[PDB]
Each structure stands twice: as structure tokens, then as C-alpha cells.
Symmetry: C3
Subunit: 221 residues, 3 copies
Amino acid sequence: TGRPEWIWLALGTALMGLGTLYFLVKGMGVSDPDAKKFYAITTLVPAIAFTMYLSMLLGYGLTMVPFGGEQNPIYWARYADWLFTTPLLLLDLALLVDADQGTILALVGADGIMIGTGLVGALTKVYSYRFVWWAISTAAMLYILYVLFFGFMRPEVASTFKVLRNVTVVLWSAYPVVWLIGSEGAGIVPLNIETLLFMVLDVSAKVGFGLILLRSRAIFG
Amino acid sequence: TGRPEWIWLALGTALMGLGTLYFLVKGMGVSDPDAKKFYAITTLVPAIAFTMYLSMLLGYGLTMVPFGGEQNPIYWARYADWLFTTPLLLLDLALLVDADQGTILALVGADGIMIGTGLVGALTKVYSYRFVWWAISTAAMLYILYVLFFGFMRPEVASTFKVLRNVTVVLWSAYPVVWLIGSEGAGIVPLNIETLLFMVLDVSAKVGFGLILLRSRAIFG
Amino acid sequence: TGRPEWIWLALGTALMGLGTLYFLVKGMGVSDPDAKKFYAITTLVPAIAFTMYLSMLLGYGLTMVPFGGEQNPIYWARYADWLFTTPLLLLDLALLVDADQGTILALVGADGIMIGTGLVGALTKVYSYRFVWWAISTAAMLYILYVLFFGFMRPEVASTFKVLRNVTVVLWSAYPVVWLIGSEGAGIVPLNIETLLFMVLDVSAKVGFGLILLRSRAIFG
Ligand SMILES: *C/C=C(C)/C=C/C=C(C)/C=C/C1=C(C)CCCC1(C)C
Ligand SMILES: *C/C=C(C)/C=C/C=C(C)/C=C/C1=C(C)CCCC1(C)C
Ligand SMILES: *C/C=C(C)/C=C/C=C(C)/C=C/C1=C(C)CCCC1(C)C
């Protein structure tokens, strides 16, 4: 199509689809309720991302937001994605360490705040205010990372939890930077490069994360 | 009103309302926590449908979607309905057989994918792509039906579960067909007939299903 | 800004923010899982309200709804707020008295119906129908209050539950009145006064309620 980021949307669509079918095949057989739980959550994540990548690819998850006296193309469908997939990823983590419900509610709630404010930021027509929403969203992220480190077993659990937690902090932290420097933000880095950055992070945080998780014996009772 | 499907919207509004008041009266008295659970879920379903039928009746849940070079009237409020009511119906089933949380999450998640993609399909302005969303949605449905049959007691539970599961597969399967042949799809069958088909399915899947369920002793500890 | 209700939006933004930081500091230290649960829920409430107050302040949560042959300014972001915060407040109550899941599902479901119909009412372009949605929403509220009184311990639990339940019925009941007499409704009381009324209720129902709750020992095992 007439959009140069189409290739990354198509590649992300493809990789999320393949990841979904892999984990779907993979989870065939599992009878342990606990593992079943990790398979459900972890397959749903790239399944959802698959549809939102397709929606961006086909142009449905794309809108135009006027700001800085111009018509800026915003892929809103990333937030419909993250809205659902980021809490699920946090659940994987939470279930791994047997977190209190209070801590899970704090994380999921913090998360919704993170994406929803990111969304508002993305759709806001007053340029300056866009970065107020960014700041609040980033504060929510920082709370989440705080909890992951100070708000929380079988060594297998701990070992896998430590790895995925590290994967999580490192990739999740890059998203505010990408946003801030890309088309939604200061407009430093073009949309096509921004889309590639998000595709590389999304596949790693979704399919990379799930591969690490689902190969672990930490998921079995 | 100037819409010939108004009669079916009015009749559905009426039947969902009556079903809600019946199950509300019916559940008065119930102290068994387990049955209480089935009453809550099963009353909420036509209550929600009642509001969405009223919203379509009054014209609020109706929008115009350009495709095939025409202004197509789409009742989007059906998806706000299903978004909430189809997972609840799946919960009735899941609680009946004491399903693992992993299986419940897979079903609810599969379900959201089903309706959300149906919604995107419904609102998509490129005619051809409408049926890509249909296909994905249908794949989600097929997964759900798979799980209902291969992903899962007191004989009462089994007996009622077997009946409602059969009701479920048969009516849920007709919805993709109706969509595909009606105004959202190929435009084979007019909107007023399509609305009647959906009203007959919705009342049967909601009020018919609940009557069968709530008369059963399968719902009591 | 050019809006005379800005001061109340700014004051609400401020008070919700301060309430969020107070309860966040306050909950530092808590290790009792049960109390943790009450801290999560109760901090999230004004956190969410903070963002929606900011969104109204900045003008993002404001839209124009034509009715009565005029362009009526509707703050839709109040419903995005309530959609999440009113169920959470009901959870605080529900967890306090150890409510059955059936009763919690009935309350949360009743609640979503309440706000969602309030939203539809708010955005409806046919003046008369606006009050049909109001009536249904009010019926949902009345059900909720019914349950709080007839649908349900340590004396501490009972004592705090009795107080907060009284706070709840009294403030929640004023919201339908405010709506009905203000800009969304009959247009009796101007928007700026309406916004002040909602700001006073919101801070009391959110921060006032949380202060009463979180000072109680009812929240600890
Ligand atoms: C499945 C994809 C994942 C793990 C995406 C994570 C996205 C975030 C952690 C986003 C955070 C952002 C902020 C902290 C600042 C504002 C903009 C956002 C939403 C990109
Ligand atoms: C309360 C009403 C019920 C049980 C409705 C069920 C609706 C479905 C099972 C819808 C499925 C569809 C597809 C599988 C294809 C795409 C379009 C849909 C959403 C009509
Ligand atoms: C955090 C704020 C709270 C507790 C807000 C509560 C709001 C309600 C109880 C709203 C109810 C309304 C109706 C019953 C009638 C229609 C309009 C509403 C949504 C204002």
C-alpha cells in the first residue's frame, strides 16, 4: 500500500500469527490446570496482537489527529491491543510468583491507567498537553516496574520470574522512549521507523516472552 | 418509525425486558451461593440485551458504514451487547462443569476476539476486508465450540450441560451465517429479515437458554 | 480557560491527585493481603478520577451533543471514570462483608448497566429519549441500593460497612438528581454549577469514602 510502514505491519501481523499458532499447538496436551493457565494467557496475547496488527495493516486501526497544525496519522489500534495484552502479560508474572490479589489489582489497574492515558495522549489535539499524558502514563509504568521489583518460591519460579521480569523492564521501558521521539511525540523519528521499533518490541515482549515462559517448567504444578 | 425492522427491535426489546423481570422475580429467595451465581449471570444477560435492543429501537445503536459505494446501516449496538453477554453465557457453561480457570480465560478471551473482530468487520469500509474479519471471527467461534466439546460431574450437571451446550452450538453457529448473508455481509437477505433472524436467535440464546438453565437443579449445590 | 467551570475541574483534578498520593503513601508498609486489597482498590479510585478530571479540564473529555435544537456541551469523561470507579467502590463494600460472588457479579453488572445507560442518555440526540435512559439507569441504581440493604461479621466490619453504606446511598442518590436538573437533563441548573455539584460528590464519594475506609481496622485480617 501507499504507506511505507506497511512492511512492518505485515511482518508483525505474520509473526504474531505464527506465534499464536505455535503456542496453540504447543499447549495441546496440557492437563495441569496451572500450566493451562499460562498457556491460555500466553496464547491470547499474540492472538490479540495479531488482530490489531492486521487492523493497522488494513488501515482500520489508523486515524488522523490534527496537532502542530498538521494531520498526524495515529495508529490507535496499538492501544486496543496493549489495553488487553499488557495486563495479561502482568498476570503471567503475577501468577508465576503467587501474588496477592491486592498486588494483582494494583498492577492491572496501574496498567489500564498507563495505556488509557497513552491513548488520550495519542489523540490529544493540543501538542503540549500530549506530553502531560505521556508523563502520567510514564509514572504509571514506573509504578508498575516498582511493584515488579519491590512489591513481591520454587527456584524454578524465581529463576523464570527473574528472567521474564528483566525482559519486561527492559522492553516496556523502551516504549515511552519510542512514543516520545516518534510521530505521536516530538516527531524526531519518522512513522515508518517508529512502526519498526514497535514491531520489534511487540514481537519480543509477546512472542519472545512467551517462548521463554512456556519452555520453562516453572509453569507446572 | 421509518424503519421496517422497528417491529422486531420492539419485540426484542419487549421479550428481553420480560425475560429480565421473570428471572429477577424467579431468583428472589435463592440463598445458595452457587445458584445465586447462575441467577446473577443469567439475569444480567437479557438485562444487557434489553438496553441494547432499546438502543437500536431508538436509533442510538445504529450507524452508517460506507462500502460497495453505498451508505449501509449497521446496528453496532449488537456488538456492545454480545461483547458482554456472550462471555457471560460461556461462564454459565463453565461454572456448570467446574472448569479450570485456564479454560475459562481461553473461552472469554476467544470470545472477545470473536465479537471484537465481528465489530471491526461490521465497520470496515473496504468490502473485501469485511470478510477477512468474518473469517477470523468465525475461527474464534470454532475454537470456542471445540473447547466446549473437547476442553472439558453430578449427572444433573452433565445432563443440563449437554442440553445447553447443544443449544449453544446450534444457535451460535447461525450467527455467522446470518451476518454473511445479510446487510453486513453479501447483502443477500434484507436488513429487516436479518433483524428478525437475530431477534429470534438472541431471545432463544438468552431467554430460552436461561429458562432451561434456571429450571434445572444443576444450579444448586 | 473560556469555560467558567474550569475552576471546579482544576480543584477536582487537584483533590483527586492529592487523595491518590495520600492513599499511596498511606498504603506503604501494608503486608496484610486483605488490607492490601482495600488499599489497591481505594487508591485506584481517585487515581482514575484524577485522569478523568484532568481530561475534562484540558477539554479532551468534553464533546458537543445536539438536542433541543442546540449544541450541548457534555463531559463524557465522567462516564469513563464512573465505569471503572463505581464498580471498584462497590467491591470495597462487597469485600468488607465477604459477599458471595453471585452478589458481587450482580452489583458490578448492575453498575455497568447504570453508567452505560447514563452514557447513552448523555449522548442521545432526541431530548425525550434522554430521560428514558435516565429512568433505566436510575432503576439500576435502585437495584444496587436494594442489594446493599437486603442482599447481604466482625463488629468492625459491620460498623464500617454500615457507615460507608450510608455514605454510599446518600451521595450516589444525588447523582441522578444532579443529572436530571443540569445540562444533560432539563437544563434547570447551569453547567458550571452542575460541575461543582459533581466535583463535591465525586471527592466525597472517592476521597471521603476512602479516608473513612482506610482509617478503619475493618480492613485488616
Ligand atoms: C504487548 C506490548 C507491550 C508489552 C507494550 C507495552 C507498552 C508500554 C509499556 C507503553 C507505555 C507508554 C508510556 C509509559 C508513555 C506513554 C505512551 C506509551 C503508552 C507508549
Ligand atoms: C446473546 C447472543 C449471542 C449468543 C450471540 C452470539 C453471536 C455470535 C456467536 C457471533 C458470531 C459471528 C461470527 C462467528 C462471524 C462474524 C460475525 C459474528 C460476530 C456475527
Ligand atoms: C466516583 C463517583 C461516583 C460514586 C458516581 C456515582 C454516579 C452515579 C451513582 C450515577 C447515576 C446516574 C443515574 C442513576 C441516572 C442517570 C445518570 C447517572 C449516570 C448520573
